[PDB]
């Protein structure tokens, strides 16, 4: 818009082009989204204005919403850095844990955060995380997900990340809750652990399958209800779970139980964030300062 002046393209996804840019007025720097035949939905418009009343200090604050000539346009905090990029700039030495600790402590409150007001990301990835010099990380992105809604792609000609997607969403169900968000998170936590993805798919079913190779063919012991659910199928291959000590070496044994428990199949048993924030994992956690490079 005309109050603002772009500085660079710093993002490329399914809602559409995210520009740094300076508000020709307060003279501040923000992230800026032009949101991606008709003219914006009211249900679209009323459901982020509400998002903009959400204040969490690990939450990336939506600063304005802007409908003007049909289009939307959505004014975000500016942060330097993405978990993505730490983590690749990081890849030689790896993330320290109580750096790890810290910023997984960080998430959960933000998570806890919006899942009191029943607000869910969905599409959680190391690229929405972002984090700043003074050592905080927050959640970007929270709630448009629901308030645009699903698309096929982006106009950029990419897709949404697979890699992060619990399970009863790869199986078809169409009413899940909160605990997607902690599935993915889990996800995240175990990649800054070993400096690698989890569970890096090249399709849903290979995605899927990844999953069941390493915890285990889900059946209705540990998950009732699983073989109901719309996408399952009875010829699914099955395969035993492995120990998470292979998995994430060498995170110690509090880590593990906490992952564990975040990686539960059965989202019911899926630890919540609130009680994720209680575990004994967290019982030294610190706010160490990490070493970025802007």
């Known amino acids: ?158 897709v949404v990340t697979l890699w992060y997607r619990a399970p009863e969403i790869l199986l078809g169900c169409k009413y899940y809750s909160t605990a997607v968000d902690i599935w993915s998170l889990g996800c995240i936590f175990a990649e800054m652990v070993t400096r690698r993805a989890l569970f890096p798919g090249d399709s849903e079913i290979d995605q899927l399958f990844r999953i069941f190779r390493t915890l285990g063919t889900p059946d209705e012991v540990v998950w ?12 699914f291959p099955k395969w035993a779970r492995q120990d998470f000590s292979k998995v994430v070496p060498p995170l110690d044994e509090d880590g593990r139980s906490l992952l564990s428990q975040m990686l539960h199949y059965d989202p019911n048993k899926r630890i919540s964030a609130k009680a994720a924030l209680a575990h004994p994992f967290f019982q030294d956690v610190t706010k160490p300062v990490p070493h970025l490079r802007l």
Request: with cysteine; net charge positive; glycine share 6%.
């Open 1 to 158: 818009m005309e109050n603002f002046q772009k500085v660079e393209k710093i993002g490329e996804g399914t809602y559409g082009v995210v520009y740094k840019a300076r508000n020709k007025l307060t003279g501040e720097v923000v992230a800026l989204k032009k949101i991606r035949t008709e003219g914006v939905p009211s249900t679209a418009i009323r459901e982020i204005s509400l998002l903009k009343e959400l204040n969490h200090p690990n939450i990336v604050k939506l600063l304005d919403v802007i409908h003007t000539e049909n289009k939307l346009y959505l004014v975000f905090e500016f942060l330097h850095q993405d978990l993505k990029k730490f983590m690749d700039a990081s890849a030689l030495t790896g993330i320290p844990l109580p750096l790890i600790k810290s910023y997984l402590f960080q998430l959960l409150q933000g998570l806890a955060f919006c899942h009191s007001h029943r607000v869910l990301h969905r599409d959680l990835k190391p690229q929405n995380l972002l984090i700043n010099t003074e050592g905080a990380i927050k959640l970007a992105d929270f709630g448009l997900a629901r308030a645009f809604g699903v698309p096929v792609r982006t106009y950029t000609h990419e």
């Open 224 to 235: 009732p209800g699983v073989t109901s659910m719309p996408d399952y199928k009875p010829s």
